[PDB]
């Protein structure tokens, strides 16, 4: 009782709540994963328009 | 008189399907045939696939398992009858699985 | 502290290891066996082979067989054995209920032995939830 | 066949195309066993499965140009087993996403392969770590 | 060219057939070897079993009032059974086995056994 | 003494209840674990696909 | 070597600068497609990829020239 009631309770709570904290950390890195593609794929519109603007400039020539 | 038709594995070219009696079991253990090549038990056939000069072929092994007749004392926890009634279904199952394995 | 244990079966050799105790269940007795035992020859049938290795009391349920269980070199010629935790709990309980479904069928004296063996399959299966 | 052989390719290709050619030879020989491989031994099974993935590695879209660096890592991924866990279908998607991720987030591989033109150990380790991280994010799907 | 092209088709199909039946030959050889290995696995058990059965019949001199599996006292209703293989083209297997089956069931209906 | 003994037994039960709360919340959070990245990333990705279609 | 952009014809069987490999095959299989893949990959490099079309219809050559234009090669 004396050994196991602490040897399986407290560390389990610690890993359990640190698992929620690590979930919050990797969720924050997922909030960064928003930026990881979002600021560029908001531009990808003007990217696929302006890259072909040069071929349209060859069309103007 | 539950006899079975399992196709024993004599040769690679053609293996003739033999007919053996199964369930009466001949309580000395000897599983016997259709009366004319009937087999004594513990004289077992174990087929082995080795290549001849060059080809694939099967060669039998008629290995005879030596039997230490009895343990020095050989106590029974059961009666002499119950032990056989619980043992011969086991040998029946073993022979059925062998007649599936060699047939396959 | 143990014996040479060889639980065999038709197409396999289930569990060849060394264990402190052997509590195989025959019809007339659940004979506990442990080192240096005198040579007995049990007709072990349906029931659990509860063994107590010093790590834990891992149980295996065997459908039937025989055991020339002698001086630390035993050969339990088991018909059908499922070792340790290879059996699964909820499927075992549903299998017990299906064994009840096979228990109430029919036919005089011909099929009642299969009914018995289905009941005893369920007795083999109760080991799973107890494991 | 090509009469030139490995006298044309770069050192990275001279390394990895050897294993690719050998594995495609073995897979093409074992191609009849594919539909009949029923629990055959692990060597045949894994080699044939990697060949079944290798042909999917080979098939590439219309008008898609794969420059030397990207196809190098693609052949390596296909031949050394770092796509064996995925099924047959997902090899294509996983490899396109891996090529994107690598060519956009490990520009040192570009420096090595385009510059030193050999598959040296630093490039091998960089590619290994990149493929591993991409397999983790592809398990995360 | 509808003359040479048909023969090219037959050449390709016969070559692919040769490849496929060679694969089936090697697969069947591996299957025979793994069944032989299963028999070799099962042989220790059967060895100790045909030793233990001799042991039991050596203790008791077939003195027994038991064993329903040795009710040998008539030939009333034989139950012949056939173990057959489940594959296609099966060599010349199925015809041989069920031919022996038909011969023996005819010879059993000679005796009036109602063979199941 | 009956109170003290059932206090022992209920203390065993309470550490078991703490381990059970742990085992349940582990399942809940580990379900959340990949699901949060899936939600955010796939919500960006499919919306990107549709916005990219209408802008093509 | 001369990268075509294809793993098949760049790993199994190379094409080096100077070696005159041959794209044979059944009609409608991708010969013009593998040739187009080679000329389209050959952008980062410096090669002057002269593509001569003999007896192809005018409209297919229009499709190929506008494909080259769309890809910038
Ligand atoms: N990687 C690919 N993905 C999808 N389609 C492809 C691919 N490669 C080739 N194709 C198909 O190949 C066709 C064009 O091939 P190609 O023009 O070489 O055929 P062809 O008739 O032999 O040419 P030609 O008319 O010059 O003889 C297209 O219809 C295209 O669909």
Length of chain D counted residue by residue = 141
Helix (H) or strand (E) holding E78: none
Residue corresponding to tokens 């696909």: F49
DSSP letters along F7-46, please?
HHHHHHHHHHHHHHHHHHHHHHHHHHHHHHHHHHHHHHHH
Whether D62 lines ligand 1, by a CB cut-off of 6 Å, is yes
Q: What is the domain partition of chain D in residue ranges? A: 10-138
- Write E94-103 long-range contacts (CB < 8 A, 24+): E96/B7, E96/B16, E96/B17, E97/B5, E97/B7, E97/B17, E100/B5, E100/B17, E100/B19, E101/B5
List Cβ neighbours of G61 (8 Å cut-off, separation of 6 or more).
G53
**Token pair belonging to E26:** 């090697």
27-56 of A, contacting G, C-beta below 8 A:
55
Give how far Cα A22 sits from Cα of A5, A18, A19, F35, Å: 26, 6, 5, 14
- Closest to A42 in 3D by CA, of C34, F44, C18: F44
E-chain residues near B97 (CB < 8 A): 42
Distance from the Cα of residue G63 to its chain's centroid: 14
CB-nearest partner of A37 from F18, F25, F44 = F44
Contacts of F36 in chain D (CB under 8 A): none
SS3 D41: coil
> Do chain A and chain C touch with ≥3 beta carbon pairs under 8 Å?
no
Judging contact as 3 or more Cβ pairs under 8 Å, the answer for B and C is yes
Q: Cβ of D126: how many Cβ atoms within 10 Å? A: 16
E90 is catalytic: yes
D39: phi > 0 → left, psi -120 to 50 → alpha, else beta; which? left
What's the CA gap between F12 and F20, in Å, rounded?
Answer: 12
End-to-end CA, chain F: 80
For A55, the 3-state DSSP assignment is: helix
Domain spanning C1-87: which superfamily?
F0F1 ATP synthase delta/epsilon subunit, N-terminal (2.60.15.10)
Q: Which of E7, E30, E56, E90 is catalytic?
A: E90
Please, what CATH class does the domain formed by D10-138 belong to?
mainly alpha
Q: Solved how?
A: cryo-EM
Looking at G1-73, which runs of residues are DSSP E strands?
none
Contact A14, F25 (CB under 8 A): no
What's the start-to-end Cα distance of chain B, in Å? 24
Among G38, G4, G14, G29, CA closest to D21: G14
- CA–CA separation, F42 vs F38, rounded Å? 6
Tokens of D88: 């047959």
* Backbone φ and ψ of C13, nearest 5°: -130, 100
**Secondary structure, 3-state, chain B:** CCEEECCCCCCCCCCCCCCEECCCCCCCCCCCCCCCCCCCCCECCCCEEEECCCCEEEECCCCECCCCCCCCCCEECCCHHHHHHHHHHHHHHHHHHHHHHCCC
The Cα–Cα gap between C19 and B35 comes to: 47
Residues of G comprising the binding site for ATP? Answer: 25-32
Cα(C43)–Cα(C68) distance, rounded to whole angstroms?
A: 9
Please state the φ and ψ torsions of residue F27, each to the nearest 5 degrees. Answer: -60, -45
Cα radius of gyration (chain D): 16
Whether E69 contacts B92, CB under 8 Å:
yes
Task: Write out the residue limits of the CATH 2.60.15.10 domain(s) in chain C.
Answer: 1-87
Class of residue C119 by CB neighbours under 10 A (exposed 0-12, middle 13-18, buried 19+): middle
CA of C103 to the centre of ligand 1 (A): 67
CB atoms closer than 10 angstroms to residue E55 = 18
Q: Are B49 and B56 in contact (CB under 8 A)?
A: yes
> Mind giving me the DSSP string for chain C?
--EEEEEEETTEEEEEEEES-B---BSS----B-TT---EEE-BEEEEEEB--SS---EEEEEE--EEE-SSEEEEE-SSEE-TT-S-HHHHHHHHHHHHHHHT---TTTTHHHHHHHHHHHHHHHHHHH-
How big is chain G, counted in residues?
73
Q: Is the dihedral of CA D111, D114, D117, D119 positive or negative?
A: positive
Q: Please report the resolution in angstroms.
A: 4.2
Instruction: Please tell me the total number of residues recorded for chain F in this structure.
Output: 56
Cross-strand bridge partners of residue C22: C33, C51
From CA C68, how far away is CA C51, in angstroms rounded?
A: 17
């Amino acid at each position: 009782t004396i050994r196991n009631s602490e040897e399986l309770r407290g560390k389990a709570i610690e890993q359990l709540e640190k698992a929620r904290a690590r979930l919050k950390k990797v969720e924050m890195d997922a909030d960064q994963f928003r930026v990881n593609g979002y600021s560029e794929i908001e531009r990808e519109k003007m990217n696929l328009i302006n890259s072909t603007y040069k071929t349209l400039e060859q069309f103007e020539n | 008189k539950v006899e079975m038709l399992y196709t024993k594995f004599v040769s690679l070219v053609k293996s003739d399907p033999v007919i053996h009696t199964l369930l009466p079991l001949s309580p000395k253990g000897e599983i016997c045939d259709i009366n004319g090549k009937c087999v004594d038990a513990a004289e077992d056939e174990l087929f082995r696939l080795t290549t001849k000069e060059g080809k694939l072929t099967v060669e039998r092994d008629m290995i005879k398992t030596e039997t230490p007749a009895f343990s020095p004392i050989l106590e029974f926890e059961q009666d002499p009858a119950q032990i056989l009634d619980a043992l011969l279904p086991l040998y029946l199952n073993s022979q059925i699985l062998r007649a599936l394995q060699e047939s396959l | 502290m143990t014996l040479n244990l060889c639980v065999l079966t038709p197409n396999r050799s289930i569990w060849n290891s060394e264990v402190k105790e052997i509590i195989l269940s025959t019809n007339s007795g659940q004979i506990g066996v442990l080192p240096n035992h005198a040579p007995t020859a049990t007709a072990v049938d349906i029931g659990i082979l509860r063994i107590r290795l010093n790590d834990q009391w891992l149980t295996l349920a065997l459908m039937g067989g025989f055991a020339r269980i002698g001086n630390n070199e035993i050969t339990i010629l088991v018909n059908d054995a499922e070792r340790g935790s290879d059996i699964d709990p909820q499927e075992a309980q549903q299998t017990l209920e299906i064994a009840e479904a096979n228990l109430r069928k029919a036919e005089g004296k011909r099929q009642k032995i299969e009914a018995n063996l289905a009941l005893r399959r369920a007795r083999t299966r109760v080991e799973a939830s107890n494991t | 066949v090509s009469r030139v052989g490995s006298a044309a390719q770069i050192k990275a290709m001279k390394k990895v195309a050897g294993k690719l050619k050998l594995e495609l030879a073995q897979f093409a020989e074992l191609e009849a066993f594919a539909q009949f491989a029923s629990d055959l031994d692990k060597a045949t099974q894994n080699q044939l499965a990697r060949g079944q993935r290798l042909r999917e590695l080979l098939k590439q879209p219309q008008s898609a140009p794969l420059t030397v660096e990207e196809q190098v890592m693609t052949i390596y991924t296909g031949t050394n087993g770092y796509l064996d866990s995925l099924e047959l279908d997902q090899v294509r998607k996983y490899l396109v996403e891996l090529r994107t991720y690598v060519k956009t987030n490990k520009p040192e591989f570009q420096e090595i392969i385009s510059s030193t033109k050999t598959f040296t150990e630093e490039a091998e380790a960089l590619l290994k770590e990149a493929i591993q991280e991409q397999m983790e994010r592809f398990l995360l799907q | 060219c509808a003359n040479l092209r048909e023969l090219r088709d037959r050449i390709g199909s016969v070559k692919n057939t040769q490849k496929i039946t060679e694969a089936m030959k090697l697969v069947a050889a591996a299957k025979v070897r793994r069944a032989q290995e299963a028999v070799v696995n099962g042989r220790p058990f059967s060895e100790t079993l045909v030793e233990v059965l001799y042991n039991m019949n050596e203790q008791l001199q077939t003195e027994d009032v038991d064993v329903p599996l040795t009710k040998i006292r008539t030939v009333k209703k034989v139950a012949l059974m056939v173990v057959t293989g489940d594959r296609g083209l099966c060599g010349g297997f199925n015809n041989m086995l069920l031919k022996k089956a038909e011969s023996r069931i005819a010879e059993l209906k000679k005796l009036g056994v109602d063979y199941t | 003494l009956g109170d003290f003994m059932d206090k022992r037994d209920a203390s065993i039960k309470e550490q078991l209840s703490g381990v059970k709360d742990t085992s349940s919340e582990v399942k809940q959070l580990e379900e959340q674990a990949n699901a949060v990245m899936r939600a955010a990333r796939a919500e960006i990705s499919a919306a990107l696909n549709k916005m990219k279609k209408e802008t093509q | 070597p001369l990268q075509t952009g294809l793993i098949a014809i760049d790993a199994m069987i190379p094409v080096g600068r100077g070696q005159r490999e041959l794209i044979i095959g059944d009609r409608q299989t991708g010969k013009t497609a593998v040739a187009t893949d080679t000329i389209l990959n050959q952008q980062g490099q410096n090669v002057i990829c002269v593509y001569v079309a003999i007896g192809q219809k005018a409209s297919s050559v229009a499709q190929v020239v506008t494909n080259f234009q769309e890809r910038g090669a």
